[PDB]
Design an enzyme around this catalytic site. Sequence first.
Site, PDB file in Angstrom:
ATOM      1  N   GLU A 185      -4.163   6.839  -2.241  1.00  0.00           N
ATOM      2  CA  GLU A 185      -3.439   5.622  -1.895  1.00  0.00           C
ATOM      3  C   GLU A 185      -3.747   4.546  -2.924  1.00  0.00           C
ATOM      4  O   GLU A 185      -4.890   4.399  -3.374  1.00  0.00           O
ATOM      5  CB  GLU A 185      -3.811   5.129  -0.463  1.00  0.00           C
ATOM      6  CG  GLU A 185      -3.170   3.766  -0.095  1.00  0.00           C
ATOM      7  CD  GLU A 185      -3.394   3.368   1.361  1.00  0.00           C
ATOM      8  OE1 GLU A 185      -3.405   4.252   2.261  1.00  0.00           O
ATOM      9  OE2 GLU A 185      -3.571   2.162   1.605  1.00  0.00           O
ATOM     10  N   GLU A 208       0.862  -1.186   0.000  1.00  0.00           N
ATOM     11  CA  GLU A 208       0.000   0.000   0.000  1.00  0.00           C
ATOM     12  C   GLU A 208       0.891   1.227   0.000  1.00  0.00           C
ATOM     13  O   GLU A 208       1.803   1.312   0.821  1.00  0.00           O
ATOM     14  CB  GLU A 208      -0.870   0.076   1.258  1.00  0.00           C
ATOM     15  CG  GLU A 208      -1.660  -1.142   1.623  1.00  0.00           C
ATOM     16  CD  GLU A 208      -2.121  -1.037   3.071  1.00  0.00           C
ATOM     17  OE1 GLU A 208      -2.752  -0.009   3.448  1.00  0.00           O
ATOM     18  OE2 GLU A 208      -1.799  -1.946   3.851  1.00  0.00           O
ATOM     19  N   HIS A 237       3.127   0.669   3.176  1.00  0.00           N
ATOM     20  CA  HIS A 237       2.939  -0.485   4.051  1.00  0.00           C
ATOM     21  C   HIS A 237       3.115  -1.761   3.244  1.00  0.00           C
ATOM     22  O   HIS A 237       2.626  -1.866   2.116  1.00  0.00           O
ATOM     23  CB  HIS A 237       1.541  -0.489   4.695  1.00  0.00           C
ATOM     24  CG  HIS A 237       1.296   0.668   5.614  1.00  0.00           C
ATOM     25  ND1 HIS A 237       0.091   0.859   6.255  1.00  0.00           N
ATOM     26  CD2 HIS A 237       2.093   1.698   5.993  1.00  0.00           C
ATOM     27  CE1 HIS A 237       0.158   1.950   6.999  1.00  0.00           C
ATOM     28  NE2 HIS A 237       1.360   2.481   6.854  1.00  0.00           N
ATOM     29  N   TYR A 257      -7.822   4.720  -3.497  1.00  0.00           N
ATOM     30  CA  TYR A 257      -8.752   5.394  -2.592  1.00  0.00           C
ATOM     31  C   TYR A 257      -8.081   6.542  -1.866  1.00  0.00           C
ATOM     32  O   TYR A 257      -6.868   6.701  -1.902  1.00  0.00           O
ATOM     33  CB  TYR A 257      -9.363   4.420  -1.582  1.00  0.00           C
ATOM     34  CG  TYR A 257      -8.489   3.854  -0.471  1.00  0.00           C
ATOM     35  CD1 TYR A 257      -7.374   3.049  -0.745  1.00  0.00           C
ATOM     36  CD2 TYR A 257      -8.849   4.049   0.851  1.00  0.00           C
ATOM     37  CE1 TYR A 257      -6.621   2.484   0.310  1.00  0.00           C
ATOM     38  CE2 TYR A 257      -8.105   3.505   1.901  1.00  0.00           C
ATOM     39  CZ  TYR A 257      -7.000   2.716   1.623  1.00  0.00           C
ATOM     40  OH  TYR A 257      -6.301   2.162   2.690  1.00  0.00           O
ATOM     41  N   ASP A 274      -7.016   8.088   1.553  1.00  0.00           N
ATOM     42  CA  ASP A 274      -6.714   7.677   2.923  1.00  0.00           C
ATOM     43  C   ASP A 274      -5.936   8.779   3.636  1.00  0.00           C
ATOM     44  O   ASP A 274      -4.845   9.152   3.202  1.00  0.00           O
ATOM     45  CB  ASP A 274      -5.905   6.373   2.945  1.00  0.00           C
ATOM     46  CG  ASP A 274      -5.917   5.702   4.321  1.00  0.00           C
ATOM     47  OD1 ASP A 274      -6.988   5.692   4.966  1.00  0.00           O
ATOM     48  OD2 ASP A 274      -4.870   5.171   4.753  1.00  0.00           O
ATOM     49  N   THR A 331      -1.781  -2.653  -3.961  1.00  0.00           N
ATOM     50  CA  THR A 331      -1.686  -3.653  -5.009  1.00  0.00           C
ATOM     51  C   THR A 331      -2.730  -4.748  -4.808  1.00  0.00           C
ATOM     52  O   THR A 331      -3.151  -5.030  -3.681  1.00  0.00           O
ATOM     53  CB  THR A 331      -0.302  -4.321  -5.030  1.00  0.00           C
ATOM     54  OG1 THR A 331      -0.123  -5.063  -3.818  1.00  0.00           O
ATOM     55  CG2 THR A 331       0.832  -3.318  -5.217  1.00  0.00           C
TER      56      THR A 331
HETATM   57  N1  ADP Z   1      -4.721 -12.278   3.054  1.00  0.00           N
HETATM   58  C1  ADP Z   1      -3.782 -11.345   2.737  1.00  0.00           C
HETATM   59  N2  ADP Z   1      -2.455 -11.472   3.003  1.00  0.00           N
HETATM   60  C2  ADP Z   1      -1.530 -10.541   2.668  1.00  0.00           C
HETATM   61  N3  ADP Z   1      -1.836  -9.382   2.047  1.00  0.00           N
HETATM   62  C3  ADP Z   1      -3.142  -9.145   1.741  1.00  0.00           C
HETATM   63  C4  ADP Z   1      -4.194 -10.111   2.057  1.00  0.00           C
HETATM   64  N4  ADP Z   1      -5.373  -9.592   1.633  1.00  0.00           N
HETATM   65  C5  ADP Z   1      -5.095  -8.381   1.080  1.00  0.00           C
HETATM   66  N5  ADP Z   1      -3.767  -8.140   1.134  1.00  0.00           N
HETATM   67  C6  ADP Z   1      -3.060  -6.942   0.701  1.00  0.00           C
HETATM   68  O1  ADP Z   1      -3.187  -6.011   1.785  1.00  0.00           O
HETATM   69  C7  ADP Z   1      -3.250  -4.675   1.272  1.00  0.00           C
HETATM   70  C8  ADP Z   1      -4.484  -4.020   1.909  1.00  0.00           C
HETATM   71  O2  ADP Z   1      -4.643  -2.690   1.426  1.00  0.00           O
HETATM   72  P1  ADP Z   1      -5.718  -1.690   2.082  1.00  0.00           P
HETATM   73  O3  ADP Z   1      -7.089  -2.105   1.625  1.00  0.00           O
HETATM   74  O4  ADP Z   1      -5.198  -0.297   1.814  1.00  0.00           O
HETATM   75  O5  ADP Z   1      -5.558  -2.007   3.646  1.00  0.00           O
HETATM   76  P2  ADP Z   1      -5.961  -1.083   4.915  1.00  0.00           P
HETATM   77  O6  ADP Z   1      -7.472  -0.979   4.923  1.00  0.00           O
HETATM   78  O7  ADP Z   1      -5.377  -1.877   6.050  1.00  0.00           O
HETATM   79  O8  ADP Z   1      -5.313   0.267   4.722  1.00  0.00           O
HETATM   80  C9  ADP Z   1      -3.324  -4.825  -0.241  1.00  0.00           C
HETATM   81  O9  ADP Z   1      -2.030  -4.579  -0.845  1.00  0.00           O
HETATM   82  C10 ADP Z   1      -3.711  -6.274  -0.475  1.00  0.00           C
HETATM   83  O10 ADP Z   1      -3.169  -6.841  -1.676  1.00  0.00           O
HETATM   84 MG    MG Z   2      -3.123   4.188   4.271  1.00  0.00          MG
HETATM   85 MG    MG Z   3      -4.527   1.069   2.993  1.00  0.00          MG
HETATM   86 MG    MG Z   4      -4.408   1.703   6.100  1.00  0.00          MG
END
Ligand code: ADP
Ligand code: MG
Ligand code: MG
Ligand code: MG
EC number: 3.4.-.-
Lengths: 28, 471
Positions: free
Chosen positions: B62, B8, B118, B55, B57, B65
Amino acid sequence: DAILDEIDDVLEENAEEFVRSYIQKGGE
Amino acid sequence: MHRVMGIETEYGISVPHQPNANAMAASSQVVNAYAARWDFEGLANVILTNGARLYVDHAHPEYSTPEVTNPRDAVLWDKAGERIMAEAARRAADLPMGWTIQLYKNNTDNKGASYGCHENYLMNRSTPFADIVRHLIPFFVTRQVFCGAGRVGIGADGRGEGFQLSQRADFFEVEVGLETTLKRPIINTRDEPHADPEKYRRLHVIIGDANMSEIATYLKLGTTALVLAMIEDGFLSQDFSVESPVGALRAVSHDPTLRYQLRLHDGRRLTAVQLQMEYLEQARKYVEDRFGTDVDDMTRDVLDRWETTLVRLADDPMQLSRDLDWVAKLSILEGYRQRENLPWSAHKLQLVDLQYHDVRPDRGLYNRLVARGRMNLLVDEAAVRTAMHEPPNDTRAYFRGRCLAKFGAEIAAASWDSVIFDLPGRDSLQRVPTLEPLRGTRAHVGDLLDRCRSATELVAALTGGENLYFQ
Ligand SMILES: Nc1ncnc2c1ncn2[C@@H]1O[C@H](COP(=O)(O)OP(=O)(O)O)[C@@H](O)[C@H]1O
Ligand SMILES: [Mg+2]
Ligand SMILES: [Mg+2]
Ligand SMILES: [Mg+2]
Ligand SMILES: [Mg+2]
Ligand SMILES: [Mg+2]
């Protein structure tokens, strides 16, 4: 060298004002 | 070896000479000008046809992937995010407001604000967290010797003069915790896998700089994944713990000569490069013990590049100016200091530090280095462009992205763990859970998706088959 001339060609104008105004909200 | 992972990146955002502009409006223009909506069950928040999330954030745009299984694919779909950001800003310039929006793939404004890149790694739930903490803290303290993006200014407020390895180091204050925006921990403890929480932990890593260099992003994700495999398997018998790890993180960053010595609890005194070499040696033994020479090519390549980079860092870091961000940036910075007799307080050095990360191909300094053949690449631009709109084939992002490409009009919402369909002639929405990251792949649903001509046909064919296609 050649690359410092290429960078000089593209640097933002008004460099001191640009740096001073680059102010961001905190994120994660 | 594979491992589900994702990156992220919160982008810096600048809209000069627009008194109406604020960060939230500008970030929304970026997200909205590029492009179904996110399934929380109010900010601009979309899922892309490559399975990524785009999105707003914390007042930054942000890009997150799709789930990938290896560090080359992490590099590929992360680089696609840079291209998506650049295009989104170009499209926002065409909105009625007409704002010229600049985006930066970095982590600080050098004035006390930081924002995040992240890394996310899928792990066994059974792995005890105390081992995760004690083995990762020394690795994260030192991996900036190849992961750092470089920074001009010392201290969170930037008041000290000089160059340091990492943008993030001055913002970390504790060893372990939940925070991501203040009092930041070396190990973040949030565990939200968007998958079966009885099976999986999602390790949420917040300490890395965003990298432009593909080699740096590759090493960051690939070396961390190898260390996680050793931690999961209980392979590390040594104690790598160091005295005052938060202070050590800062001291390592603040010494780009790479001579600062960490004080290990077991009595050793090692530089950050030397401690990284200890992790590399264990990773080599781990892979030899587990696989012999039956090692997959990418694991071998990560080990080879990790070792080569550490050897060159201990020899002469400036030979890595085509590979690592902080070295490439420092080479420009020292070039100007020599040519123009500039002190480290010079505003031109601050401008180089920031503009290195500008996503514009014509203006960003990293992008100019690439254009002039002065940076080594890992992937080719044709593949990056394809990854902007096609998902990985070997995770559940495949189903998510292909559904949006093929049945987008009938997708009500989507998230990491579901796709929600809005079918004609139905009062109720159809939620398809995608709970396993390594199901919903092309091998699972590709042929089904090929032969379905409508979302109604697809939901019909998936009905009662949830425990076949997706879990
Ligand atoms: N089960 C999983 N294990 C590892 N990475 C994951 C998994 N599910 C989603 N991801 C990755 O975690 C990230 C989540 O992004 P995001 O939606 O911005 O998270 P957050 O809401 O915590 O900010 C993405 O890069 C996604 O590919
Ligand atoms: Mg963020
Ligand atoms: Mg995020
Ligand atoms: Mg976050
Ligand atoms: Mg605490
Ligand atoms: Mg959340």
